[PDB]
Amino acid sequence: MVLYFIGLGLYDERDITVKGLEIAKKCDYVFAEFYTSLMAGTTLGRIQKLIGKEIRVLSREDVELNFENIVLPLAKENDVAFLTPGDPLVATTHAELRIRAKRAGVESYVIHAPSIYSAVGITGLHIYKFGKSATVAYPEGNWFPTSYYDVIKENAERGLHTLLFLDIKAKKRMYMTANEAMELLLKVEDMKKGGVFTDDTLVVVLARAGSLNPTIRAGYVKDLIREDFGDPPHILIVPGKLHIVEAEYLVEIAGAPREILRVNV
Amino acid sequence: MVLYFIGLGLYDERDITVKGLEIAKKCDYVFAEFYTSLMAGTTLGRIQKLIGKEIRVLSREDVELNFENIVLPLAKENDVAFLTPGDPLVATTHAELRIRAKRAGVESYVIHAPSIYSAVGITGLHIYKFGKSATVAYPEGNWFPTSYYDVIKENAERGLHTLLFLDIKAKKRMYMTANEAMELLLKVEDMKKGGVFTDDTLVVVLARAGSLNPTIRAGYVKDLIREDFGDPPHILIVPGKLHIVEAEYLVEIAGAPREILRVNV
Ligand SMILES: Nc1ncnc2c1ncn2[C@@H]1O[C@H](CSCC[C@H](N)C(=O)O)[C@@H](O)[C@H]1O
Known part of the structure; x- marks a missing residue:
């Protein structure tokens, strides 16, 4: 039961690292946010096809106000991934989400991207x-x-x-x-x-x-x-x-x- | 006619992006430099195995003194990859290599990585x-x-x-x-x-x-x-x-x- 913060990179679905892809492919639940940046060379469908999993997209409110009620509950009994454009901890406030993870007794790992x-x-x-x-x-x-x-x-x-x-x-x-x-x-x-x-x-x-x-x-x-x-x-x-x-x-x-x-x- | 600057990322062979891996696999020749930094969590053999191509490692002198005699000649009539630790062009000396490519009539593209x-x-x-x-x-x-x-x-x-x-x-x-x-x-x-x-x-x-x-x-x-x-x-x-x-x-x-x-x- 863990939570992975995985970056998707700069432009299209292939900007994810091999490490990030192999880990995402094996997660039980996959969430993502697409409000921090714009990936102009892909679509949700293409990303979903690449990782072979359904991706639940979260809004800024879902994350900032309810990350601990939507994502963390599942991470306590499953392998969960949270995808973001570029690098998940750059020019975002997502670092704070790792503290919420700790508080919920959920170990978190970070997979970087361009x-x-x-x-x-x-x-x-x-x-x-x-x-x-x-x-x-x-x-x-x-x-x-x-x-x-x-x-x-x-x-x-x-x-x-x-x-x-x-x-x-x-x-x-x-x-x-x-x-x-x-x-x-x-x-x-x-x-x-x-x-x-x-x-x-x-x-x-x-x-x-x-x-x-x-x-x-x-x-x-x-x-x-x-x-x-x-x-x-x-x-x-x-x-x-x-x-x-x-x-x-x-x-x-x-x-x-x-x-x-x-x-x- | 094409030279691809491809980043290998932060630590091991899976830190390259999916885009970089797929492009490297289709290249006729693959070169790499490990003087701007190193990939501590992997080996040349493991990188070679992932890409499925022999990797010609270049020293600082090979690049700074002879890039146009070692890499560019082949890039003139083939698709060539030049791998570097991290993200290409972060190392200060990388950028100038794109000018060398231009001077040799070789197209170059950059594939980023963490x-x-x-x-x-x-x-x-x-x-x-x-x-x-x-x-x-x-x-x-x-x-x-x-x-x-x-x-x-x-x-x-x-x-x-x-x-x-x-x-x-x-x-x-x-x-x-x-x-x-x-x-x-x-x-x-x-x-x-x-x-x-x-x-x-x-x-x-x-x-x-x-x-x-x-x-x-x-x-x-x-x-x-x-x-x-x-x-x-x-x-x-x-x-x-x-x-x-x-x-x-x-x-x-x-x-x-x-x-x-x-x-x-
Ligand atoms: N591919 C790209 N090309 C140009 N600017 C980009 C870009 N991706 C992000 N940005 C810039 O960064 C802003 C989002 S800031 C969030 C950045 C993201 N975590 C990362 O690691 O890249 C955008 O509004 C834009 O100004």
Whole structure:
């Protein structure tokens, strides 16, 4: 009687690890949530066919409010798996669910999978140079989130890159595009005047990481803000000072303006 | 005409993704490098058996000096796979290899897999709170590198966690232990006296991430410096101020002392 937290990866059903698949295939009950991220290259049906089990999808409320009443009860007398997009413990609050598991006397194990947090390495930007991360949240009513702007400022001041997770409204089927994120950032800039994000700021966009042909683009906000980066999910990155090799990759692979090759050391 | 960069994941031969395995199986030639890191929970033989292909292992020199003479020629007229521990392109030197492919008229695609960079999510520490990362290198002769100490200092003063990759002598398969890293840091502290790493510093050790039975331990240096965390690899994290939820996970899951709930939050 145990509970497995198993990541499904970045884009499609084949992004699950072999370990995760073999373990999922032998579980008695399989649950999953698809509100923390978007797997744009698969369907519930394909995932179900791969693991050979029926998958009960849980809503954010089911998990946050009733994980211990829906999943844990079964884990006390059966092998249960809880599937999630990407890595189950990255940019989610699922780690806390392991405490609930302990309290219920249920042992839990974690099976990792490709995460967008590390996949950004495909942009050519050195992973160790990424600083604090942030999420660009949709404004709601009179509330306009701006914390992410300060994160960029803090990292950039230290010469570090900033990974910006983009908002998602699973129920409404709304996925924030890199374009919308840029528009919001420009609005915060006009409000704060920190000189952190402007039309001349160099940015990198990574869309549908995990697919064989993800969209990887780098350039100035003024040029990319109205560019079509394809279907979601998208992630936006605001690089700090570039090493020469980072600039070379952005130019050669992400189509960045050749002028960025001339770094100001 | 195609080169696939395929990640092998965290620990053993089943940490490769289903996508990576199926693609590797269909490749005409398969190369691999084990110098950026190692796969401690498996062997080349077990990886070969899973993929059902002979694996040509390449040294750091083979890759950095002769990638275009060893791998690319075959990729020109065949489907070739290049396996790497973890997630491809996390290691800083990997990215440039895609430019080499482009220069040789070879298409390249990246197949992601779990990376320790994202797997640390299992420590319960929020991924967004991780700042710049660093590597603790073994001092040698008259060379005593200490830049990693400064990374911790700069992250911590901003309330961010610091991921410290530990040194490895790839060919000899000798891993720096978290204990050795702590000893080194106390030594650097005694030299810099910045009050960044002392007996009272709270640290988190993650050993054998990817395994079903990783060791996750949190506590003060004075208590953990001589503790046995099991077989390698080891990762050391120096967290910044903790969110109560992070602290509760460290206490409940990582055996941290209750004291952290009042001292480090
Ligand atoms: N394949 C992908 N391509 C681009 N962005 C992605 C992505 N998968 C996730 N994201 C980004 O991350 C956000 C979800 S955050 C949850 C992340 C997940 N646990 C993981 O490990 O990846 C999305 O709204 C999007 O901005």
